[PDB]
Amino acid sequence: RKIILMGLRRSGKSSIQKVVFYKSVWDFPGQVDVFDAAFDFESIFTQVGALIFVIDAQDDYLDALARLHVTVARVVTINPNICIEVFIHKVDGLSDEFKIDTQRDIQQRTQDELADIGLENVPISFHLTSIFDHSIFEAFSRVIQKLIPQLPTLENLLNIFCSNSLVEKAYLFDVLSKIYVATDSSPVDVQSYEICSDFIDVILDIGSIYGRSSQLKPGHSPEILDETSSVIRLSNDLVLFLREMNQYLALICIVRADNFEKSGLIEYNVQCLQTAIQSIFSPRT
Amino acid sequence: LTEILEAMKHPSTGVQLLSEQKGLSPYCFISAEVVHWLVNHVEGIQTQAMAIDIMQKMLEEQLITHASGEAWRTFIYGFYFYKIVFASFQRKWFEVAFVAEELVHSEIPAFLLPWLPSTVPEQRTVTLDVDVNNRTDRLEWCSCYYHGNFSLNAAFEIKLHWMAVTAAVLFEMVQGWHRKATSCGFLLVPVLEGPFALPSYLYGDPLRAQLFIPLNISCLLKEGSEHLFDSFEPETYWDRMHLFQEAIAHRFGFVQDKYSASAFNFPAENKPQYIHVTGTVFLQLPYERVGYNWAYNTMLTKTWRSSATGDEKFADRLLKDFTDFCINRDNRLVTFWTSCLEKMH
Numbered sequence: 001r002k003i004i005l006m007g008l009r010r011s012g013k014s015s016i017q018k019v020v021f022y023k024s025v026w027d028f029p030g031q032v033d034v035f036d037a038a039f040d041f042e043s044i045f046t047q048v049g050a051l052i053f054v055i056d057a058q059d060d061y062l063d064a065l066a067r068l069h070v071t072v073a074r075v076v077t078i079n080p081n082i083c084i085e086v087f088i089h090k091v092d093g094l095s096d097e098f099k100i101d102t103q104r105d106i107q108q109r110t111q112d113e114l115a116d117i118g119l120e121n122v123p124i125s126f127h128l129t130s131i132f133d134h135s136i137f138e139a140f141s142r143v144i145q146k147l148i149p150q151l152p153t154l155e156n157l158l159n160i161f162c163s164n165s166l167v168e169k170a171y172l173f174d175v176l177s178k179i180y181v182a183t184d185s186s187p188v189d190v191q192s193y194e195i196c197s198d199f200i201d202v203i204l205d206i207g208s209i210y211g212r213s214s215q216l217k218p219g220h221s222p223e224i225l226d227e228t229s230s231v232i233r234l235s236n237d238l239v240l241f242l243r244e245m246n247q248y249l250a251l252i253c254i255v256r257a258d259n260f261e262k263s264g265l266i267e268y269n270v271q272c273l274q275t276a277i278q279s280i281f282s283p284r285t
Numbered sequence: 286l287t288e289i290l291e292a293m294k295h296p297s298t299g300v301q302l303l304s305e306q307k308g309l310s311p312y313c314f315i316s317a318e319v320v321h322w323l324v325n326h327v328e329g330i331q332t333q334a335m336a337i338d339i340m341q342k343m344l345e346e347q348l349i350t351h352a353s354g355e356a357w358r359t360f361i362y363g364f365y366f367y368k369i370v371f372a373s374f375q376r377k378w379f380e381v382a383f384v385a386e387e388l389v390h391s392e393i394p395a396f397l398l399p400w401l402p403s404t405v406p407e408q409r410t411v412t413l414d415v416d417v418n419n420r421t422d423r424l425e426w427c428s429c430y431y432h433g434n435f436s437l438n439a440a441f442e443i444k445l446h447w448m449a450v451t452a453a454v455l456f457e458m459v460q461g462w463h464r465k466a467t468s469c470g471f472l473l474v475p476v477l478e479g480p481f482a483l484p485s486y487l488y489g490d491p492l493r494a495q496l497f498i499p500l501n502i503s504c505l506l507k508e509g510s511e512h513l514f515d516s517f518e519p520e521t522y523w524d525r526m527h528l529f530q531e532a533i534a535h536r537f538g539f540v541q542d543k544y545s546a547s548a549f550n551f552p553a554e555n556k557p558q559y560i561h562v563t564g565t566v567f568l569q570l571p572y573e574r575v576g577y578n579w580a581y582n583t584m585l586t587k588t589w590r591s592s593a594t595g596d597e598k599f600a601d602r603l604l605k606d607f608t609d610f611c612i613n614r615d616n617r618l619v620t621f622w623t624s625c626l627e628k629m630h
């Protein structure tokens with residue numbers, strides 16, 4: 001399945017793919033929409049499960065809302081299993097009072113015209129994104145969580161792992177895109193998410209500097225390498241640690257240093273969660 | 286007759302009869318939709334007048350009746366509830382008649398014609414259940430005063446009077462009305478109620494006064510005349526001038542605002558009012574110093590603004606262009622007026 005980033009001109013889609021994708025995501029342009037027959041829209045929209053519409057908060061959005069409503073009607077008449085999300089963008093220059101009023105105005109303007117159309121069965125989500133923050137990564141993570149059909153199993157696994165091991169917060173990141181596949185039931189703090197995102201940057205950059213011998217051997221590694229595991233202790237009685245789960249996944253957990261004295265039991269539960277994740281994501285019958 | 290109602294009661298194509306909404310009888314329908322159906326799928330009538338005659342024949346034979354049981358009325362074209370076989374029904378449901386206004390068949394304008402052309406109430410009242418989402422535990426209600434008639438070249442007025450209403454729930458209901466009006470192709474905006482009233486009046490403001498835009502009708506006069514319509518009879522002449530002035534108001538997008546006078550008789554002391562399509566500008570024709578009375582709609586704020594209302598500087602540009610047109614800048618008005626003479630073939 002693919003992810004289609006819709007919207008209008010000067011909405012911020014190219015900057016989103018510059019930040020997230022450039023460090024299946026497709027960017028349709030702000031013009032030549034579904035009324036035009038320049039592309040086979042019904043063939044693409046059948047294979048696409050996530051539709052994202054980017055709405056500028058500062059600019060006028062009523063024509064954007066009408067284009068969004070006719071695009072929602074088009075994709076519902078194509079397939080009933082598509083997920084629709086609304087990306088309210090360019091909120092870096094806005095104040096704290098402006099964002100809540102803009103979100104309330106956009107949600108009240110959209111969810112009543114959804115009832116006016118009559119397609120009340122489909123769920124439409126709303127996200128506050130900005131390319132200068134990490135909220136675009138969290139919004140794309142919540143988009144990606146809808147497409148994965150294995151989200152409640154991983155979420156229940158992370159819930160019982162956080163309850164058993166006294167782990168405050170857990171994420172299942174993808175290290176290439178800094179997008180977390182699953183997290184626990186506790187809310188995601190932005191101060192936790194920034195240091196969890198930069199933890200991957202420190203690990204990947206130091207492993208790119210010093211992981212030169214073997215590592216990227218063209219034929220095959222003669223010895224199987226260890227998984228990348230890291231531990232950082234901070235001064236505010238908190239410990240961050242990573243364990244490499246798969247070839248593209250990792251598990252960053254936030255644990256108090258009072259509870260990190262029994263780090264062997266947390267390591268054993270991380271190994272059991274590694275076995276669970278590698279058995280879930282393996283090909284089966 | 287009977288087979289027409291049997292064709293109307295078809296479940297497959299039929300007419301869209303109303304559902305089991307609370308307060309409404311079964312087999313209820315809107316009169317406008319079934320008049321539109323009796324235009325198309327019928328035994329051979331075309332215009333609306335004989336469709337109204339057929340529905341009046343069905344009303345006289347008690348095949349259909351009003352949803353209130355008021356079996357004394359004629360068939361009224363518009364949003365009127367009728368069912369297939371008192372005044373408390375009039376205080377619950379909105380019922381707006383439709384004016385079948387004749388189109389301008391004569392290419393000569395109405396201020397240049399050789400001969401001038403020359404039931405339901407004007408205002409209707411319903412009682413509104415303001416709280417519909419049950420946000421408040423108490424009972425809230427307001428009285429709504431609306432126009433009994435609808436015309437496509439006239440503005441439709443809604444007046445709300447309230448005491449026992451929490452104004453947040455009323456603002457939510459008006460915002461839902463504004464969203465529905467934007468989706469339906471209309472524009473529902475708040476307007477001033479007394480925009481040309483004196484400061485001593487009830488609806489007037491002490492710091493508000495109207496601006497005057499003079500209309501230069503001296504340049505439109507011929508060589509040796511003092512009346513613009515001296516070729517016709519003089520007794521209708523000012524009325525012709527009124528129509529001519531209305532024609533210029535129809536060029537700049539002003540719609541006639543038939544305001545209901547609050548118990549005011551003596552119809553020479555109330556003047557016709559015009560409202561722009563954006564709802565930004567009021568316009569009044571006075572009467573002797575032929576021109577326009579210009580007022581701003583200060584009730585139109587940012588939250589009601591859209592693409593159909595323009596920007597915040599639309600009214601200043603409209604004032605500048607209207608002042609330029611009324612003063613005969615670049616011989617624009619003569620370019621209008623002689624073009625009207627080009628309709629006098």
Ligand SMILES: Nc1nc2c(ncn2[C@@H]2O[C@H](COP(=O)(O)OP(=O)(O)O)[C@@H](O)[C@H]2O)c(=O)[nH]1
Pocket residue numbers: 008009010011012013014015016027029030089090091092130131132
């Ligand atoms: N300062 C700032 N600028 C932004 C933000 N989001 C988008 N922009 C700017 O808005 C422009 C939007 O372009 P875009 O719609 O993505 O181009 P398109 O994809 O080809 O239609 C970009 O060139 C950005 O420079 C933001 O959050 N902050």
